[model samples]
Target: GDATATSASSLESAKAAWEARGQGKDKVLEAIAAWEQAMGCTAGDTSPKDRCSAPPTTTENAETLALMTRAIYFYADGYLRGDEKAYLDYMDRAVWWGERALIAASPEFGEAMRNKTKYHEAIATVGIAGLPAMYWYATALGKWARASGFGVLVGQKDDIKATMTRALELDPSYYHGGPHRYFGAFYAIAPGFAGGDPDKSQEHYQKSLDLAPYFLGTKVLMAENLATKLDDEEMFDRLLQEVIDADISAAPAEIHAEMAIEKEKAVELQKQKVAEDWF
Candidate 1:
């Protein structure tokens, strides 16, 4: 039987519960731990515990494979959101666990691991998705830019493009809403010559919204990216309000709080001239 519904629903419920508890940093950490454990990874300092007492084939367990995948996604997401240290640390961990999962996985699990491997690779080079690798890569590049501060020596974009592109090729709708939302944001904000097409971005965003209207983050990113670039205050206002009006019931507490903060930032940024700004 497909574990999609079970795994996704479990993840959603866990996310909502984590959010309802008030999105504290500690709460986020706890949620991450739980999510990781659900995926079968031995998280935190539990390594000292007797592994011999546990099942030898824990990583190969079918019941926990989905959880592990979800854990990788969540950890990557943390990095995408700008937690540099956490992003790098978890990314390395994700890669390690992802590789382990691949080695011990069933056919279906193998496919997922391949997708994740591509995802990590793309983000490490390009800055397409909000995954942890993308964030860390971007942050590292940004720091490098500050150090260099040279003329016409900018960092690369389109890091996660290939990864998500491959993901869509493998599973066009892997996560319900699809990766189009992130692509839309990237295209909307990036340079046109470098694969940033505003029109394509809008198209992707609309497709994502059509698929999952409840995904407030997508809506927010699309609106903010478009409005800031095009100097469209009306669009900005509408999108920001839409973000505020979104039903975040399914989100984790940390996500809810982050959304609120993002909303404020978007509103403030809307008041400023961001058309000339990059990054």
Candidate 2:
């Protein structure tokens, strides 16, 4: 219980640090280290070479598991906050610990691995999120995707998809309605001829909305992808309006700035009849 409680406290502290100063790499690293240590102490083996001494029977073990879950969150948030390197670095460590933790912590391992998969996927997306970051993120995902044996075991598309599906099955709206929205974006852009399914993507986006009406990114992404790719003006306008109307409180300042520019471009394009015709 002490170990678990300590991990919980460590997680809170790490969150506070990130909130106070976004992208505080040191804080993120500290949290990862704390989690690694906590998992080591409570689970009773720090390396793959060792085995869990015994099943955890006390409140402490439960708490430690809880902390491990929280650590997964912190690691993920770190990636989303634009610390791709940190995310990748810590993720490597987390995965190693996660495998051990899973063996040491059975039922808990399933959920932990799911969460870990998210972090890896997010890191993989660093390249696709935009220019500069996109190439690297894509590389990360590709490398992991191609990794033999264990890497393929955990990082494969089917594996990640299965984990995410399971996560949604367990809690349909976990992480601000994550699985649906994430898969929506992935499916929409994946190339139908190859395996993309815009309909499936739309369904997931709609499901995400049902789970969390305030998910602005889902709304924005759905509109951006559909309008730009599918040329569905009405649906695009409707979803874009939802994005504009949704509170932008949770969005990063840079994202807000980018949106402002995009809004300006949209208006300018409309003025030039670009909305009706394109090059």
Candidate 3:
């Protein structure tokens, strides 16, 4: 019953630490320690914070889950946009911890969902209700597997696809149409031999763009990935320039910060395109 005896002071201490460092390897590590004090619970059965006789059940689940997801967000940022440029191996470790947070927030079926037979049930049981957890789970999987040539994520493409699909089913607009963006990126990289379809990739890109045209990364995916793969230089140029020209004032406050990043990425990408003369 004591699996989540959350501490107010510790949670605040964690918040203070997170706010102090903003986003960095140091911030993530420091926040994780503070969160450890706040949560005082772990998936470990016989280790510290091991007072639960069963998977935790609580009306406080929402708040407790937020604590998990909050730390997980910092972990994601540490990997994706930490205040510093963290090395991949170091970020990989942070992503691994993100996986644990997702599992904890998920229904009791957590890791076992990896089994194909139980996959659907797991989605229905936890995947639908745990969008933040599920979203990070897919993000972690994709990031970790990015460097490998399908070598590391054996049998995981479909799992991620399905998770993202169901997550869309829950909220197609979450994170400015991230579901569509993920699909766009996924199909663009896959080879036909591996079940990739350029058309399908375009379809997702179109959807992502339509959903959040202001999210420059959406168009970036379509241009840099979809158009490049389709060998349409015109399309690529058009998309990149559009992102560079976009007005950040049009973006909602919540997502304008991300738009700033995307716009810069587009600008930097254009520089690469010129220096390399990418057609």
Candidate 4:
């Protein structure tokens, strides 16, 4: 009754804030409070795994999934703003909330999880509609894994790979060819013993670049992840230069925030090259 109405009102207010201030950090922070209120959780609470309940409304859950995706990316952007642990702190919360949203939104996945199915097994039940949660959840987990420890990395690899695979099957072009870009960077960073193949890395990166020519992040990822992995200075320089020089206006306005981050990263990558020459 009133509970659902209040939740929807809070969510709508949060949606309004996001619509009004697309990538503004303060506004997103505002919406975080509003959305969490809708989710029946305390604002900025990092332990949603323990405190938050499932969103009662499916639409609220769906919107919350989108909010988590944007929040994770924004948290990553904060790392470039000089906060080394921003992703770890903020993304951890988003990851748990995202999983909750996924469970609320996808019945098949929800049932599998309730049965204690492994993530790799449960991932197969998620369809195209669940891609947003699955993709962002995996992204958050991957960052956490890398930043945490080797054991964490090893523990998450299969599930992350499975989620990305399912996302690719549902839609390769999502979030500007995100699945392909993910595999490109993933394969680049992995060792051969862990199924790392530089050839596949290049292939996936190439596919992402071809799919979204205007998406500068893919180019930056290819340059930083794949190029540096192979010690190909020319490739590194060319890709970063392209990212620096490309007119971000050519891409859709929706992804401009991400492109802004990539442009900044391109500059940082160049500085790193000068300071620590891999070649």
How many backbone collisions does model 3 have? 1
Model 1 accuracy (lDDT, Cα): 0.50
Global CA lDDT computed for model 4:
0.77
TM-scores of the candidates are 0.53, 0.50, 0.72, 0.89
Q: What tens digits encode model 1's per-residue C-alpha lDDT throughout 156-213?
A: 3433455456444444444545567656766776666656688888888888888866
Residue 151 CA error for candidate 1 (Å)?
A: 13
- lDDT of each residue in 13-77, candidate 4, tens digit only: 87787664545666667777777777787565465656566555374467576565567556555
Residue 12 in candidate 1 has what lDDT? Answer: 63
Q: How much lDDT does each candidate structure score?
A: 0.50, 0.49, 0.63, 0.77
Candidate 2 Cα errors over 4 Å, as ranges: 1-26, 41-155, 220-245, 248-279
Judged by TM-score, which candidate is best?
4
Residues 1-279, candidate 3: write the lDDT tens digits.
342345666566666765554334466556556555554444331322342234233424434444444454445443444233343443354345444555666646565656654654565556454776667657756765664447665467777777787887888877788888888888887778876888888888778778877788788768776787887888888888888888878777755545665676677667888889887
Local error of candidate 1 at residue 251 (angstroms): 8.5
Candidates 3 and 4, the one with greater lDDT: 4
Candidates, ranked, TM-score: 4, 3, 1, 2
List clashing residue pairs in candidate 2: 1-60, 4-63, 4-64, 127-133, 127-134, 127-137, 128-134
